[PDB]
What we know:
monomer; alpha+beta; Aminopeptidase; binds coenzyme A; binds N-(2-phenylethyl)acetamide; N-acetyltransferase activity; nucleus
Amino acid sequence: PYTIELIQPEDGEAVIAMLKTFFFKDEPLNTFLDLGECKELEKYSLKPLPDNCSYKAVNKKGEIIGVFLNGLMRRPSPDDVPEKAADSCEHPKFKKILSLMDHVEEQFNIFDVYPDEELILDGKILSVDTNYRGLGIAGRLTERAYEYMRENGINVYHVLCSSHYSARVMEKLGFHEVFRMQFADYKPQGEVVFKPAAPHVGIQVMAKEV
Length: 210
Ligand SMILES: CC(C)(COP(=O)(O)OP(=O)(O)OC[C@H]1O[C@@H](n2cnc3c(N)ncnc32)[C@H](O)[C@@H]1OP(=O)(O)O)[C@@H](O)C(=O)NCCC(=O)NCCS
Ligand SMILES: CC(=O)NCCc1ccccc1
Ligand SMILES: CC(=O)NCCc1ccccc1
């Protein structure tokens, strides 16, 4: 038995504690790099919370057993000055992840796919406690966001997935691929950076129109 609830500002520490236990250790890129202590990822994860559209799954004892942290994303302004997230990161391992994210954004802009949309929901951090996996919690977290989208006239939910394994979960939930890149083809300075196990394959950006 569990609830799905809006994450409140006072939940920040508990959210970080849960992420440090699971996501920091078990998301494929993080574990491949052996991310370790990473205050930059803590900072990254707390950022979307004040957008008031991030959800926690909470067990019968009041413990957080899953989160989906989402933020609003806006179409770049006509006078936009694009910035690389990796530039302001001092943690070398997390910088590799941010650099990959920057590369994806350089190759693919979700707003090109949906010219009429000004605001899109961005699913940033998805994590479920191991002992509660395979129960559909990811789906119920995702579904709660549909409520927010309806309430705010948002049509598109965009989720960058770091493995084919998690992309498949999003497919089950009704998302489709909009961009992909194999790890074997990601060679920003001429050489492969990420070489996780073969089944991960690469990143897939997933989208659903709700
Ligand atoms: C991705 C993740 C959030 C999925 O959460 P979830 O609530 O377990 O999702 P689901 O219940 O839909 O299970 C997904 C699949 O995991 C598999 N699974 C089944 N039991 C499982 C278990 N005990 N443990 C792990 N995986 C299990 C199944 O293939 C299942 O699919 P199916 O139920 O449709 O057959 C979770 O695996 C996770 O936290 N992974 C590590 C962090 C990560 O990679 N996050 C996503 C980054 S994009
Ligand atoms: C939806 C989701 O959880 N994407 C994960 C991207 C990612 C972010 C930070 C470190 C590693 C990987
Ligand atoms: C079009 C398709 O077959 N996509 C799934 C395989 C895949 C390819 C690249 C990165 C991640 C995953």
